[PDB]
Design a protein around this ligand. Structure first.
Ligand SMILES: [Ca+2]
Ligand SMILES: [Ca+2]
Ligand SMILES: [Ca+2]
Length: 301
């Protein structure tokens, strides 16, 4: 209605000319509302209409990350914010579809990944993608505002996050002991860091009809750190088998490998309660405070 033209008008002041009749809306989170549309050449676009000021400084890092990945990576797509203003952020839609279920819709047509029948190409192509991504020059990231860890900084970071969560909620004795055993085991910790995506899940992985990964979306957590974060999805969704398949493909295409790689990722998975507790602190939401204490194995009732 009055919204549609408003979009058409905002587009014109940024040199983007749309077909009024193709527009679809999507999630309007705390920060922006999303719009789908075609331009007059038939190309599909994603438009973000901000609904809060500070949209520039909030997105600066993600825009730097997206520009870096676009410059260096050629075996997968990432959003390329070729309109980047206070009024409008817009990019050409990536190829393919997000893996997994397509929620928030009528009908129940597209379902979650079937772990009994994962195509081998899925793990192989994700290993290709992560190996290329993690090889992007960290020196170039360091010239930007991204967080850049050495391997010792990544280890210290985990140590510090664990201490901060313990100070707020406490942590069960056996779990704390397991976390500290991991932190103190030199053989577990990688001796290299690389640029990660930082938010790898099924819904952030774009796939083609053969389940080849063609792109990744949602890059707000990108940083140079322990690459192990980007293997967690495979372990949680596909078990040890899917984790091992991804490690093998990554290792074979030339990604950094170390002998305790798989065991380290599983210990990092066992530190998931740190992240639940961090969200409970940041959000203040009672449900996640409850979830954080059970996951931290604090004796409850
Ligand atoms: Ca490209
Ligand atoms: Ca810097
Ligand atoms: Ca109870």
């Amino acid at each position: 209605s009055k919204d549609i033209k408003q979009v058409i008008e905002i587009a014109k002041k940024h040199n983007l000319f749309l077909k009024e009749e193709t527009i679809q809306f999507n999630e309007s989170g705390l920060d922006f509302q999303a719009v789908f549309a075609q331009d007059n050449n038939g190309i599909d676009w994603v438009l973000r209409l901000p609904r809060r000021e500070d949209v520039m400084p909030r997105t600066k890092v993600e825009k730097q990350a997206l520009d870096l990945v676009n410059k260096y990576a050629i075996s997968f797509q990432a959003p390329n914010w070729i309109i980047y203003t206070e009024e409008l952020i817009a990019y050409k839609k990536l190829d393919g579809v997000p893996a997994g279920t397509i929620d928030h819709n009528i009908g129940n047509y597209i379902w979650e990944i079937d772990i009994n029948n994962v195509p081998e190409l899925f793990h192989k192509s994700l290993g290709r993608v992560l190996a290329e991504l993690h090889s992007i020059p960290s020196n170039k990231a360091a010239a930007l505002d991204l967080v850049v860890h050495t391997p010792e900084e990544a280890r210290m970071s985990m140590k510090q996050r664990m201490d901060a969560v313990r100070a707020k909620f406490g942590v069960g004795e056996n779990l704390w002991n397991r976390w500290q055993a991991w932190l103190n085991d030199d053989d577990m910790w990688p001796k290299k860091t690389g640029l990660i995506h930082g938010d790898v899940h099924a819904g952030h992985t774009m796939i083609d009809k053969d389940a080849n990964v063609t792109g990744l979306i949602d890059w707000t957590e990108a940083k140079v750190t322990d690459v192990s974060h980007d293997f967690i999805f495979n372990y949680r969704a596909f078990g040890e088998e899917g984790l091992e398949a991804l490690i093998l493909a990554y290792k074979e295409i030339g990604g950094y490998y170390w002998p305790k790689m798989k065991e380290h990722i599983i210990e990092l998975n066992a530190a998931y309660p740190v992240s639940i507790a961090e969200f409970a602190l940041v959000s203040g939401i009672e449900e996640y405070e409850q979830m954080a204490k059970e996951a931290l194995e604090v004796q409850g009732s």
